[PDB]
Amino acid sequence: SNAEERRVAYPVLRELTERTGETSALMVWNGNESMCVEQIPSRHQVKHLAPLGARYNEALSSSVQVFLASENEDRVRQLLRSGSITLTGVDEDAVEAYLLRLKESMERGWAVNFGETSIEEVGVASPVYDHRGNMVASVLIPAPKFRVSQDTLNSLGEACAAAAAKVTTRLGGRAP
Structure with a gap:
């Protein structure tokens, strides 16, 4: 599964x-x-953190934010109200804020989880695209909150976005 992605990504993750x-x-x-x-x-x-096979379904998980940016709004709504993707106190305006948070991540180039799913973990993630412009994966940097300040976080995000752009490039892909 995901063979070319895995192959191209490995040197870039290392x-x-x-x-x-x-x-x-x-x-x-x-x-x-x-x-x-x-x-x-x-x-x-x-x-x-992020051991092989680990699965994330919290809305505020960086990785999860990146992928939900690739979904239709209504699909995001359905996933939150169904409880498939979990979010604290979902209602019209929490959903709307979350949707804006998605768009902001696309324009920033990375999503951010700043101790927001777990008080002792932080994360940034960025999307990887294929040659048709499909989002096919994302790169995640998880880290313990204690050693990562907001500033360090912003620097990880840029690093994350740069690495995701390298994987996309190497796939023959192009961003949105």
């Missing part, structure tokens, strides 16, 4: 982890979950 000192992961979307299919561990991990 490079990303040597530059950030943090875990790098390639995520794929199955429609209601983000799944880790390839990862390089932090040179100093405490808790093992």
Whole structure:
């Protein structure tokens, strides 16, 4: 599964982890979950973040935000109100804020989870595209909150977006 993506991403994730000192992961979307299919561990991990096969269905999960940006709005609505993707106190305006948060991530180039699914974990993620412009994967940098400030976070995000752009380029892909 996801063979070319995995192959092209591996050297880029290895490079990303040597530059950030943090875990790098390639995520794929199955429609209601983000799944880790390839990862390089932090040179100093405490808790093992984004281990292979890990599945994420919290709305505020960076990886999950990136993929939901590729869905139709109404599909995002259905996933939240069904409980397939979990979010604290969903209502019209929480959903609307979340949808705007999705668009902002596309324009920033990365989504952000700043201790928002778990008080001791942070994350940034960026989309990977194929040659037809389909979003096919995303790159995730998870890290422990204690060592990552908002500033470090912004720097990880840029790194994440740069790495995702390298994978896209190497797939013959082009962004939106």
